[PDB]
Amino acid sequence: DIQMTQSPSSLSASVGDRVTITCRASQEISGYLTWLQQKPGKAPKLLIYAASTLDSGVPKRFSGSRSGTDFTLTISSLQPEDFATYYCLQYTNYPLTFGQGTKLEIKRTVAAPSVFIFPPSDEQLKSGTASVVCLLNNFYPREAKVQWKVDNALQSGNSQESVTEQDSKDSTYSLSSTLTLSKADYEKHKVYACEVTHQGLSSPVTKSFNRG
Amino acid sequence: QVTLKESGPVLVKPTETLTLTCTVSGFSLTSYGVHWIRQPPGKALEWLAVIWAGGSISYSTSLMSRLTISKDTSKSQVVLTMTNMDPVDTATYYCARAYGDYVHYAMDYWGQGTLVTVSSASTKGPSVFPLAPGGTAALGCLVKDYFPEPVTVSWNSGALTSGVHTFPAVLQSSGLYSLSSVVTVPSSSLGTQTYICNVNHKPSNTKVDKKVEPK
Ligand SMILES: [K+]
Ligand SMILES: [K+]
Ligand SMILES: [K+]
Ligand SMILES: [K+]
Ligand SMILES: [K+]
Ligand SMILES: [K+]
Ligand SMILES: [K+]
Ligand SMILES: [K+]
Ligand SMILES: [K+]
Ligand SMILES: [K+]
């Protein structure tokens, strides 16, 4: 099988900047090389086929070139909607084979999170469990530290985090941290707090509530 | 409208058979071929097979004995059957169009993709719980203990789209998925505007609408 070696594997670049993604084929593929764009949670979309032919409707800032076995996708002046995973695809022979992908993130200025905390609902507590949710909204970069303190006691092993994909307009992220406790444990304590550390904050931010 | 749409049961037990249908519109299956591609979660695309306009089929060699492809031109459908499914076959499965009868015709339009989960666990619909609320408040819904993926969340049957963040599902150690969906709204709307999270879990035929009230 033909191996397509795609580089780099991740890029982070600013709006207006130029980026280059390359794919080397392990054998001659003539010009039978396609570039695809895959937004998170969506199907791939055709950008370029036959190595350099721009598909109808694709913005002119996308262009493809060849230098033998090396194929290059260039995005000339990046836009916030360009965050995606990009793939090359050869179709000279079977099996068709893909590069392993380039994840492109839009780089932007640091933005501090807005923090929100949510107590468990009475409906959930009637089921025997208590989920406490902390929300970090619209921040950049993704790196953040969320510590749960229950009656000023630090928690470990009982929370899980999830992060969104970048916003197509302002390139920020949101993050949720969910502290799960048994109902018995939740009733034994009063102050529930999430402390958020992020480089966009001059000092940690704590949001808390009192059970009741 | 040129479109391709995958459908079929999304949960397959180990050693049992996957059947996916690709329904096409805006072109004829005796003029265009249809490729099948899959993508394990977080991994790269992998090509599986193609059925050409004239009916010849080509397969990925290592998977060829497990794959069969049928065409129904009147129904505008191609059907992929994959036998002896294993957990490593959990993936989003895609069909995609290419002209004619030979591999050098580039594939152009892709379908939306369908998430196939291979597991011996049974289906379970979601429990939905409210996440109750400067001049901006946050509210949300916790969508907990469902299987398999995916669930879809909307707010106010689609009217509320700005500010909505629906987080990726987290697999819990129990094996059931959980996620939250949050939205930021003006605090001035909390007493007057109605906020309803609409949760649809097609694999279990479960629809839940949960109103979120500011406690
Ligand atoms: K070549
Ligand atoms: K060849
Ligand atoms: K900065
Ligand atoms: K804050
Ligand atoms: K906010
Ligand atoms: K709050
Ligand atoms: K969780
Ligand atoms: K810091
Ligand atoms: K389906
Ligand atoms: K047809």
Author numbering:
A (entry chain L): 1 to 212
B (entry chain H): 1 to 82, 82A, 82B, 82C, 83 to 100, 100A, 100B, 100C, ...
Copy the relevant paper text.
The crystal structure of V21 Fab revealed high structural homology to parental 44H10, displaying similar loop conformations in antigen-interfacing areas and minimal root-mean-square deviations (RMSD) between the two structures. This difference was primarily mediated by the HFR3 residue at position 71, where K71 (as found in parental/V21 Fabs) formed a hydrogen bond with the main chain of L29 in the adjacent HFR1 loop. On the other hand, a valine at this same position in V14 was unable to mediate the same HFR1-stabilizing contact with L29, resulting in a distinct shift in the HFR1 loop. This effect was compounded by the HFR3 residue found at position 78, where a small valine residue in parental/V21 Fabs enabled the K71-L29 interaction. Conversely, K71V/V78F mutations in V21 increased the V21 heavy chain RMSFs (mainly in the HFR1, HCDR2, and HFR3) throughout the simulations, suggesting increased heavy chain flexibility and lower paratope stability. Nonetheless, the reversion of L-K60 and L-R66 did not fully compensate for the decreased antigen binding affinity observed between parental 44H10 and V17.
Here, we describe the humanization of the pan-HLA-DR mAb 44H10, a murine antibody displaying significant involvement of the framework region in antigen binding. Murine mAb 44H10 was shown to target an epitope on the HLA-DR molecule conserved in humans, suggesting its potential clinical benefit across populations irrespective of HLA haplotype. Using a structure-guided approach, we identify and restore framework residues that directly interact with the antigen or indirectly modulate antigen binding by shaping the antibody paratope and engineer a humanized antibody with affinity, biophysical profile, and molecular binding basis comparable to that of the parental 44H10 mAb. Here, we describe the structure-guided humanization of mAb 44H10, leveraging CDR grafting methodologies further guided by critical insights derived from the structural characterization of both the parental antibody and intermediate humanized candidates.
